[PDB]
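Thread: Modeling a multi-component assembly for a lab meeting

Hi all, long-time lurker, first post. My supervisor asked me to bring a structural picture of a complex we are working on to next week's group meeting, and I have zero experience with this. I have the sequence lines for every component (815 residues in total). Could someone generate the structure of the whole assembly? Inputs are pasted exactly as I received them:
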Amino acid sequence: AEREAMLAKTAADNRKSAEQVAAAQADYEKEMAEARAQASALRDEARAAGRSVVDEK
Amino acid sequence: TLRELRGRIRSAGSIKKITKAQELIATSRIAKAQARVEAARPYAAEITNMLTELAGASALDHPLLVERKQPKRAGVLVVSSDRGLCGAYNANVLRRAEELFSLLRDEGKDPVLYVVGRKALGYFSFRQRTVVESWTGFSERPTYENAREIADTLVNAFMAGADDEGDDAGADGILGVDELHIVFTEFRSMLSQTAVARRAAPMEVEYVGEYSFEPDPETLFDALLPRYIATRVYAALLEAAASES
Amino acid sequence: LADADAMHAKALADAKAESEKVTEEAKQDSERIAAQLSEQAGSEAERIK
Amino acid sequence: LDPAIVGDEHYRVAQEVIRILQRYKDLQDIIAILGIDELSEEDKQLVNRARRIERFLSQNMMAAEQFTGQPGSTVPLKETIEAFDKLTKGEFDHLPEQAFFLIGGLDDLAKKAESL
Amino acid sequence: LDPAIVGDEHYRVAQEVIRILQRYKDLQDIIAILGIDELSEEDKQLVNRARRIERFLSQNMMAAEQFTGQPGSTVPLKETIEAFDKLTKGEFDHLPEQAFFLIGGLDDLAKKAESL
Amino acid sequence: DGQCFLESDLFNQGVRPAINVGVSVSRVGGAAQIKAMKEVAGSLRLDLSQYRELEAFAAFASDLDAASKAQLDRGARLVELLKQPQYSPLAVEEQVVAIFLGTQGHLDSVPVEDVQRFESELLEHVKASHSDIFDGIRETKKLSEEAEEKLVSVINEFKKGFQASDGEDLEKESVKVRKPAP
Amino acid sequence: TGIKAIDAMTPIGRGQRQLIIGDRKTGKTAVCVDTILNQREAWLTGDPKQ
Ligand SMILES: Nc1ncnc2c1ncn2[C@@H]1O[C@H](COP(=O)(O)OP(=O)(O)OP(=O)(O)O)[C@@H](O)[C@H]1O
Ligand SMILES: [Mg+2]
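Re: Modeling a multi-component assembly
Sure thing. I ran the full set together rather than chain by chain. Output:
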């Protein structure tokens, strides 16, 4: 009864490495994409607002 | 203008001449394909006679003979060529495959497919459809090894669906198919060529009405059936190539 | 299992650094383009005068 | 140009290159539209040979120094005869397409082959 | 026609329509002899789209009242641009071709298509 | 001493300048343009010419090898790079930077559909960071190895940071049994 | 010149003649307009040599 847990933990450990590294990489990609998108957006809308206020003045 | 007209005239003339030349290439290869295709008849006739004689005095029970009691899924294999300029041949293959898929969709079964050839592989790559495995590079000239390995793969896939209940793979450990189909083209005549799709996964027996076995009859039977399947698969290829040319 | 929870701090730290740097760059280029367009507006105002 | 006062080596050099170029012009539009896949084995090998010859004929000139930074080169006659015989008999069909463009000499060809 | 005077969507849609029509005109020479069998699907899709759009450019003006005996129609520009964007998207490709002859708006398009 | 040919077919294709590089030529050569331009760019017209010739020649080829596919990709990147919209004045330093990044194959990773925008992005970042390199050009009219290394490091860091936004009639087969039907 | 294609393709040096030929609706006036507007930055500095 001390050997089935052996294969169970071996199988869990063999895949947990890949699962965790994939999760970390996906989270990094999502956060960097969100940051770049928000910064680029902010830039475009700020340029549009400046264009509009310059037109008004 | 003048230069454009002269260039187009020379272009079209040479195009015409070499289209005739490639037509001659096809005509020349037609004779070789026709000579090669009819060389496997005696082996198939002998093996079919052997199977008839053996199954006459044997028990009728086998996984490839018995049917799955439930309609889970159905496999299919599609063949094609390895060169273009074939006209509507590949279009005919795609229409027949799509119509067979439509007929099978009436039962709601999710089917699986296998492909042979670059053209069909690319066409299905462009579309949103899954592919298990592809074979390419021998449609111009096949052998027995590829047919044998394809038959082995199909047989193992069919056997791996013994106890696939629901989504459970059971003791098989992998989801297995329950039905197989083959779509190809037949050489009716020099100008008559049509696509034929047929089902040959589960054997069926018909009694038309009306020796000694050194080894075990069932051993001979289950050693025999895979050879028959492989021979059918091999016989399909040369027919397909001849119709293509 | 002990090693599993090491890189998450790095991920959070780099996410924070990326966020602050991109906000800084957006602020800087926004103010610069606004100032340049305002200067062009002043130039054209002088031109129309 | 005649075998009367010049060796016939030059003569069949010229005949080989000229017939190669003529049939290449014949098959040009076919390889352009129909596709290289339909040509025969002899025609495919000949078309490759004609491409090799066409690429090898170009050569830099020192008067192009103000236009291109690569300095020009000069080659004698006998070595060119030997190199063309080697090309037209069909031993240099393994070189890449770019390896035959803007070549000083045979040793320059070897150096550029070793550069790729 | 200029983006400084016209909306960006109008400019982009016009440019895309011109590009598609120009590509079809370019391939018209080759398709004239062989057809569609040799042509790949990646161009068959644009061929179908181009045929559908160039058939959609037709219209039934009032001026034909004494020739075909049918009333004409008028369309606001916003409806025109939105319909052309939808058509360029490829949503309408499943509909039959002969449904796009002499039609006024997209609602009449749908009604005629469903009527057959 | 030199002329440029323009055609409407290229205009409708999408190339806004719509200049045909196959025929256009200048007899004065590169002696007029700056030395840094000559060092950075050379025989580009040739490379585009073999690219166009190869595209016309192998439009219907059944099989392509690695060299041909690589040349096709490179020429596609270059031909899409050179396009410029109307009313877009530019300085010489930005032009030489764009040509330098295009020619060295650093942009081969990005798919075609985003090759343009990415360029317009990077020109902005260099404006605020490491701007003095531009300054150097203005007083050198040439590139230095240290400045080139700084530029390549900066573009590598940016491309590491940057992300890509794209990417019945059925027959049966049976067996005959002589045994009478049960 | 402002357009990168011309300078990268066929450089223009002072004292040299260049020809522009094309059909209608091509945009050949745009190149001249671009060059003329580009000259302003050069004329910003007061040196007669520029
Ligand atoms: N880079 C560009 N991108 C997009 N549109 C452009 C570009 N350059 C020019 N155009 C447009 O192309 C058209 C060219 O107009 P233009 O008056 O220059 O024509 P032309 O062919 O020189 O003929 P002409 O002077 O005889 O009237 C205009 O509509 C202009 O806005
Ligand atoms: Mg004009």
